[PDB]
Amino acid sequence: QYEDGKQYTTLEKPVAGAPQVLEFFSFFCPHAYQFEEVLHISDNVKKKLPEGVKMTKYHVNFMGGDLGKDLTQAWAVAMALGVEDKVTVPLFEGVQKTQTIRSASDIRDVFINAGIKGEEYDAAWNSFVVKSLVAQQEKAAADVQLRGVPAMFVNGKYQLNPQGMDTSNMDVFVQQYADTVKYLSEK
Amino acid sequence: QYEDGKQYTTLEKPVAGAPQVLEFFSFFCPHAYQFEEVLHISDNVKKKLPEGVKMTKYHVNFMGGDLGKDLTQAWAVAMALGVEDKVTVPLFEGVQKTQTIRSASDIRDVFINAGIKGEEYDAAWNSFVVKSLVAQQEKAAADVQLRGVPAMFVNGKYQLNPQGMDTSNMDVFVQQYADTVKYLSEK
Amino acid sequence: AQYEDGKQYTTLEKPVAGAPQVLEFFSFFCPHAYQFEEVLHISDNVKKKLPEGVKMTKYHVNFMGGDLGKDLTQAWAVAMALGVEDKVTVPLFEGVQKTQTIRSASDIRDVFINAGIKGEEYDAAWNSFVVKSLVAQQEKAAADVQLRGVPAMFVNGKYQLNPQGMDTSNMDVFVQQYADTVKYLSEK
Amino acid sequence: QYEDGKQYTTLEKPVAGAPQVLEFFSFFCPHAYQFEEVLHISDNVKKKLPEGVKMTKYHVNFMGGDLGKDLTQAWAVAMALGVEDKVTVPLFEGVQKTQTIRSASDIRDVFINAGIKGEEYDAAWNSFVVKSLVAQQEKAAADVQLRGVPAMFVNGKYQLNPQGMDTSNMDVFVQQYADTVKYLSEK
User: Fold this and answer.
1) C7 touches chain D (CB under 8 A)
2) Which residue, of A77, B63, B141, D6, has the fewest CB within 10 Å?
3) Alpha-carbon distance C97 to C133, whole Å?
4) Which residue numbers delimit the Thioredoxin domain (chain C)?
5) Which residue does chain B place closest to A65, by CA atoms?
6) Does the beta carbon of A142 lie under 8 angstroms from any beta carbon of chain C?
7) Number of domain units in chain C
8) CATH of the domain at D59
9) Which domain holds residue C153?
10) Nearest CA among B41, B43, B35, B45 for reference residue B94
């Protein structure tokens, strides 16, 4: 069964005060099929978790310059507003599929087209809460010495290792991934 | 049993003079685990292709700036020298894993390590064939309106649709994808 | 993730042409005791993240030190001209700050002699064209970057390091974030 | 274990009638980042001390000429009026960051902008309380033969020694410094 080095690995230096389950992603990478695939795995991780054990998703800027900084801030906004599930897909499609997101107002347009009020978006963008969420996202990624996405960490201590899981079958892989997160969350 | 809209799609404007089978990739995306997974899958699809059917692979620079452009040109050099199988893994790991690839000369260094004579690499770098192959890789991606990698196209008319296939099994999927490329090669 | 203009570093509105690749500014007068030593140790721990190549220049600056401070910029010019920075840095700092035994140009010359520099080589350097030129270079560099305090660090006359943009809660994390920023900027 | 020469050192000639805990500072040294660090530390130490222990802070003119003398006087004004916490940051910022403070009326401008009525400022500036407080700030620095700032002395007998604590972490540092002050204050 378990063992460090197979289904997960142990951080040599644990992050104190990290979310209990922390997933990192980027709107730029991976691309369509592989991004949708991570989303489905994440969903099943979420469903199959203990009692009040919360899943947190942070945005990371690999190679995105100003637009990626702005997406990390807009992700802080989506977390402040509680609208993560209304914006994920339009932001991902806008960045990658239609390529209609190239500047900060295009991101804002996505929120307005998802039913968030313009003035609420602006008030959030400028808030101390959003400033702090931006800093939190950046600091977590440097604390885990983040090398690439997707990635998932539990209790600031264990990194999921999908390469030490069976990929021959998709549901076997997905349920082993979700079960490993659950097992780790109790460890 | 195949069906336009399920396991492939038809491009509005076919690309004339296109390779029979063209795969696009980027050294920057997807990230390490998923990039290796896709490279293993691609190798397994290739192994299962008909007799005189060649898999051509073109590099795409999504968001890599000057380094990405040098990598397309190094990949044109790989193609011209016939050393793709020698440099693929060391380029991918130097870019993504050791992060030792940051400049053009770091790229040069990989090819010499892989056993390419340096003057022969510099000659290929500056050649008409390489200049043309860089233009070809950039034009192919523009002509198919490429929005993500991995992607694969047959006779510049048909786009493989992995999400239109059976993903639940690694075997059924690889077989399915390979055989889809067969139906299309014969169109 | 990573770098951002304004966070780990800031960008000079007018880059200094002909600047050293890595330029650190310091004063023998400020900061004091432990904070001076802390900076001395940080600057080392940064060297040791960088290639034998990548090049660590230090310039002395006289914030409010009057004639002594002027003699100190000139003695540091001599230190650079003779290549004895490592031999004089701590004795000059201690003499100025700890024992207060450096009060004149003569006391500074004593420190070089006591650290092994022949008095006749000290004096020939003191009065040399190179040292005149180095004094002007150190002054001009600090004006060109509009230096407002020490310590400070500039990469290629363009990027000013910003320690307040870095994780300051742990020293190990701080210095490595700092050093890595230097290497990153040394490419840009 | 608490050791003379380690977390503190002992004055060769104790200073009779000194404040219980006395911090020396200068608006001129150290500079920006390290100044802010020392203020943060001092602010968080003061929070960690017992309700009895009283923390006094004197200004020192380290190479400040006439401006530094005016700053000591203005600090005397801050002390007499109990506004040290309203003006510390703007005085530091105006001297060091914006360099808008170059003469006595720029100092006064800081107090006004901070909420001090001009006539109230001017009366304290000219008071004999402030004139005695200036002499006291000066005599105290000479009494401990002050060589640099920051510095902190307990009962005019023990000087805090930062390089005797563990400085690897801020929270650990602050706690051992506040603890060392507590220790020293009871002998």
Assistant:
1) no
2) D6
3) 27
4) 1-131
5) B63
6) yes
7) 1
8) 3.40.30.10
9) 1-188
10) B35
